[PDB]
Design a protein around this ligand. Sequence first.
Ligand SMILES: [K+]
Ligand SMILES: [K+]
Ligand SMILES: [K+]
Ligand SMILES: [K+]
Ligand SMILES: [K+]
Ligand SMILES: [K+]
Ligand SMILES: [K+]
Ligand SMILES: [Mg+2]
Ligand SMILES: [Mg+2]
Lengths: 111, 244, 198, 170, 183, 115
Amino acid sequence: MEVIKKIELKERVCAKGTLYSHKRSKKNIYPRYSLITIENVKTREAAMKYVGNAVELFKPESTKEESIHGIIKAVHGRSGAVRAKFSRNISPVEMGSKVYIKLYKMNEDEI
Amino acid sequence: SCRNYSAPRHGSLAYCPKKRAKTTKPAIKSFPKDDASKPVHLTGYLAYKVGMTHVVRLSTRRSKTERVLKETQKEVLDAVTILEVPAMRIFGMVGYKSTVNGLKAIKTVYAEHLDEQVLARLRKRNSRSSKLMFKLYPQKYENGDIKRDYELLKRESDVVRVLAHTQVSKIPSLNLKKAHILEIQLNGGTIEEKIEWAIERLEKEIPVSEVFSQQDLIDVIGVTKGKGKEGTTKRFGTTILQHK
Amino acid sequence: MIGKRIVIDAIGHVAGKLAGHIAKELMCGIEVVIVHAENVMFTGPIKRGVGKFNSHLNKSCSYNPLRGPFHLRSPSMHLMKVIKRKLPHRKSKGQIALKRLQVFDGCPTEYLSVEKMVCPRDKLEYTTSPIRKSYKLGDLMIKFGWKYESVVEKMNQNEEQFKIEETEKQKVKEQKIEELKKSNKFQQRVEEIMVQMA
Amino acid sequence: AINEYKVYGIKIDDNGVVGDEVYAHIVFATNELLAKSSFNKILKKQKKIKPKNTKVIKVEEIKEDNKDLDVKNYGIDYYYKSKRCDHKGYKEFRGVSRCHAVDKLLCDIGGRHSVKRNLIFIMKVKELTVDEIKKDKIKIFAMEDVEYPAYRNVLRSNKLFVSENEKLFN
Amino acid sequence: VYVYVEEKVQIPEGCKVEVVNKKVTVTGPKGTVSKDFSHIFVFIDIHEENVRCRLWNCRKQERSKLITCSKLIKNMIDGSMSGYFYELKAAYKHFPITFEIKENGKLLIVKNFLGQKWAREFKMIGDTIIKQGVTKDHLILEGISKEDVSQTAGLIQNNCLPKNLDRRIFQDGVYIATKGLIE
Amino acid sequence: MYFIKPGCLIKKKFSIYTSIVISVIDNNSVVIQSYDKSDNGDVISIDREVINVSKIVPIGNIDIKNKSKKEIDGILVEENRNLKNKDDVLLMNDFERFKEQLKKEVEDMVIEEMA
RNA sequence: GUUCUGGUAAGCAGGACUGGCGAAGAGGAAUGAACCUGGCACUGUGCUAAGGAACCCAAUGUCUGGACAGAGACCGAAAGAGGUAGGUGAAUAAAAUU
Ligand SMILES: [K+]
Ligand SMILES: [K+]
Ligand SMILES: [K+]
Ligand SMILES: [K+]
Ligand SMILES: [K+]
Ligand SMILES: [K+]
Ligand SMILES: [K+]
Ligand SMILES: [Mg+2]
Ligand SMILES: [Mg+2]
């Protein structure tokens, strides 16, 4: 079963993170950008080393497309969180989900 | 503005909402505190209401401070109710365990031979049955399942209760072929003693003289007479309005 | 992350401070189990706590009490309602989040073996001064009709038995292995397996 | 943080250097602009020269050495404005610089009397030996007779959740 | 703010003391007593045949608690070398009060107070025992713990007074006469 | 329990190396001589500093009844000579790390068969 | 907002000066015609204001003093004692005290 293999392949090679919010103020949301936390990264200086890296959301139960790709654009706040952009806008139903950080840089056009 | 004169409320709010009882047969829901210092005994029973009559009794009750010399004796007329109480038969037992959510039942164990009157409660319509109810259970005696069951009850329980049914066939005026079943608690001694006392008595008949004696005080639980839908004047006792 | 579970021992933490940290995790998809809810600590004298709770029982719906507030009387359920109102519970996202939480008075038998976490920033001896009073939630709730105190004392005695047995069972294996591995009979086979992997 | 500056200035009219006097003023302030502000304030109250007739010729910072961070005793004479009137007083402090002494007074009065730093005025700062000390507070620390243990616990790690069996504090 | 506060109590020749945490336990001729100081912020230890309390950098109202702690420890030591006593005396202008000792000196009954026909019953707290004095109107209490002894005596005194009568005409009562250590 | 007095040895918050107290100012501040190391190329530095007591943890005592700055630098460089920033497994190259891993992993396979 | 006249006053009646709402959206004071920031065609990337930074809810921590009252963060007078932190001026002193 290909899904079980594709997971183990990704698990061995990537860092792990979770999606927790869109970019927002107290009143309005900006769904083009999403906010991520990475496992053991806990300062803004530590987080700067990931700016530019590729990210992937893998979803095996999906009928349309099994994974969405994206890129980390900027650091956010003072405790090591980041801001990222994806080829499609993330649904509110997909918040709380697991994200993979891929250890190589890509250009803003590739996504 | 405040009302002109004071008066009490009509009826008690301790009984609201006043809805209809679900079935006609009551469970004893609360039992007196156990005491390990006494012998094993039963705490309750079932009875049927017959009717009323009156009696005359002698009395000598007066104030302790009353200065009268003579040992005055006086007749008093009193009304009384008669209840019929045929012997109940024991047919099983249940053990319970204490938890953060109250008492929960662990297992139930039944006698090897059960009566037609008690099996009749398990089906809905009396005259239409294949009667294959408890026919496979007796194997559990041969297999030692019963002996494993008693072990589990004896090992892990806080409260023990017996199951008893009433012999409806002795009271023909009821027009009833299904026995009534009640769960009754055992107080006194330790869990082991309680279980042994029960085991000795499955299938046997306990007379009312085991449980109660003359002059005792007892609590009676029942469902009242029915009166249908009714207006406020009778349901809560409110006054009738002006004639015009 | 969805699919991660965590078990928290609630003893010695200040109630309102732990609740904030827990609520954030529930919104990130973690399943949380809290154990020992009867040992959470509130600051100040118990006298003040009693008055704050009396003012709460006075609140009710004027025309129908079966709509009005429900006043919960168990340490587990009380701490549950403290966490509930630090989440967006009028909306679907909060109702989903709440169903990921379980709270127990004492420690149940299915959670004796599992390893347990703690939150140093919220422990009383870090976050408060020594010169002022405090009380336990188990001490307040006996005054407002909790009825299962003794059931929890019996549980607490089973835990102590399991702790001494597991520690005794561990220390023997530690001794056994550490005394074993110094031997020649052990150190020989290191070579015998390495001959086939070098 | 607070610094020490010395400002120099002269009078001018429709023509230059109308008086041959030069005036000076030592001040504790956070920056040069707050220093220059004080110079204007004092000139207008002790003499009557308003800014349009003044020119500042120099501003200099004053700095100590103290490479070994040696600890010294200082006494300070001050006043502050309350709701009633102006209140004078004297207090003693310990530190590694005159500025270190002065920043501790400003913090103290804000704590004890609810006053913003701009309503406090320093009159004199003096360095003192052990025989000169007047009030009770610092004398035990000056005579070198103090030891005490730690009351505050300290965290071992930056992690929010840790295993029950780990060491938690210090 | 006080820089340093220390208080000390000396352990006599026969006595033995131990400190587990903030519980302090005392043993000696008359028996054993113990008390837990976990509700006070203080550091307690045993050093060179003394019991020592200490604090640093504390407020005025914290040092009062330290001192109070030190006086309670001394009472425990004294009470262990000899117990304490309290003496009670019945007073009456018309109706003689009478006393009964029951349960080996653990229960006291009082009868005929101001002519009342109902009896009163008082129970002894802890280690305390009740005994008859020099004439029929006197009682003596004896025990190890100054707290337990004095609390008991107080409860008797506080209940055995007139109510709803003018106390400067009706002067009857049971009064605490004498108190001290036993010889 | 240890005490904060001249010659106490302390660690600072979230730090591995020892430092030493030189003078006591008030009931909450001290002057310390502090050791630290640049992981960029083993470059050490020792300097004096004023610090509040809520950031430090005491661990022991030394004499230093009378000494100069250069002497105490000597005391400090001896004291923390043995210590390190990180476990070497994270510093070494990939093949060396794998070689170290194998030792542990094989040892378990022996123990699980031998027990 | 700053000021004035009549009235015990009033979300009361009536004038003067400089900006508003009327005819004004957006972000902030939980909510509010008029208060704070600041004037609007339509898109994209960066930065700041006012106001925030345990959790609801995007971003939070540190240092030094006070304070124990179901207090305060939101909140009433003349009159006062008690507890505690500091200033100044009088004494006395065989630790200090008033
Ligand atoms: K009316
Ligand atoms: K009931
Ligand atoms: K109009
Ligand atoms: K306009
Ligand atoms: K709004
Ligand atoms: K309005
Ligand atoms: K947040
Ligand atoms: Mg009718
Ligand atoms: Mg507007």
